[PDB]
Design a protein around this ligand. Structure first.
Ligand code: NAG
Ligand code: NAG
Ligand code: NAG
Ligand code: NAG
Ligand code: NAG
Lengths: 49, 242
């Protein structure tokens, strides 16, 4: 909207914002994250993973 | 003259500037309750109109004799009063103490026909005038000192109060905090007549609907009838059998 600049997802997090200088619409995405898993045979067999 | 008409489903405004897409967001704020009593002031040639946390205003006349508003505590020279006049070219905003005139009116265009004198008047603000078959809606509320005015212009049909849905966009704001208790409209002036509506706002809870574009399309007034309470509890506009 001409008078709206903020964004809002389903519940509580911002996902859009308007550039203060020029009229631009651009998203916001959190930086990547996740778990780390290690695959290995038994130590009686090898030591590489 | 005074009468009473049903308020229908009018008086919805954007509560903030946050964009939403296909949401059924539920807000708790001051609104105009659905199907209330609005005092129809029609054909007054020549009152008080006490001011509360929120008021309402709507008119459709093209005579342009309706303009400007006054806010204050006692309308006297011992207490500061906020006077707003939206004339053709700009808008006058000032906080001054004076005894006013016999009747506050624009001497058509002497602004001195309202106020007699002035006092310490350090603040003074000028902005773009609100003026720019048709219906004009306004919402005047004062929260934590900030003065917010919401307005919208729509093409009316006939001259009576119509039906339909339309949301009001915010226009201006101002952080001036003074003791405001009473408000009164201004008439510029030989007889005549005028018509306008006055409503009172109360703290309620609503269920707004945003479409894919972010425009308000419908609303539900909770605590009005059991169906509305069911809709608000389910956060939906359609209810299955059960
Ligand atoms: C308005 O007030 C009258 C009594 O003064 C009442 O009968 C009526 O139900 C109220 N509401 C409407 C919409 O007229
Ligand atoms: C504000 O105006 C009301 C209404 O006259 C008055 O009772 C009150 O004393 C004034 N001052 C404050 C601080 O409320
Ligand atoms: C209308 O308001 C502007 C605001 O500054 C003022 O300059 C102008 O004199 C006003 N018009 C008349 C006819 O007084
Ligand atoms: C003018 O001075 C008096 C003295 O205290 C003050 O109460 C009043 O608020 C002042 N007027 C304005 C517009 O600030
Ligand atoms: C919002 O934009 C979409 C895509 O152009 C359009 O189909 C829809 O009618 C718009 N809604 C408005 C302007 O209320």
């Amino acid at each position: 909207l001409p008078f709206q600049q903020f964004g809002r997802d389903i519940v509580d997090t911002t996902d859009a914002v308007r550039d203060p200088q020029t009229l631009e619409i651009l998203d916001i995405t959190p930086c990547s994250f996740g778990g780390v898993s290690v695959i290995t045979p038994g130590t009686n067999t090898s030591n590489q993973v | 003259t005074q009468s009473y008409t049903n308020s229908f489903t009018r008086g919805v405004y954007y509560p903030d500037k946050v964009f939403r897409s296909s949401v059924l967001h539920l807000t708790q704020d001051l609104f105009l309750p659905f199907f209330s009593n609005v005092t129809w002031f029609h054909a007054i040639s020549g009152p008080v109109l006490p001011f509360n946390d929120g008021v309402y205003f709507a008119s459709t006349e093209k005579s342009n004799i309706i303009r400007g508003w006054i806010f204050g505590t006692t309308l006297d020279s011992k207490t500061q009063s906020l006077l707003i006049v939206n004339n053709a070219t700009n808008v006058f905003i000032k906080v001054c103490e004076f005894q006013f005139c016999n009747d506050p009116f624009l001497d058509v265009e002497s602004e001195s026909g309202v106020y007699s004198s002035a006092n310490n008047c350090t603040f003074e603000y000028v902005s773009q005038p609100f003026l720019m078959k048709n219906l004009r809606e306004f919402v005047f509320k004062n929260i934590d000192g900030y003065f917010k005015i919401y307005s919208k212009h729509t093409p009316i049909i006939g001259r009576d109060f119509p039906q339909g849905f339309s949301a009001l966009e915010p226009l201006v704001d101002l952080p001036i905090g003074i003791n405001i208790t009473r408000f009164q409209t201004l008439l510029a002036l030989t007889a005549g007549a005028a018509d306008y509506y006055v409503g009172y706002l109360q703290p309620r809870t609503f269920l707004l609907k945003y479409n894919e574009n972010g425009t308000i399309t419908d609303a539900v007034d909770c605590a009005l009838d059991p169906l509305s309470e069911t809709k608000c509890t389910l956060k939906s506009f359609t209810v299955e059998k059960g």
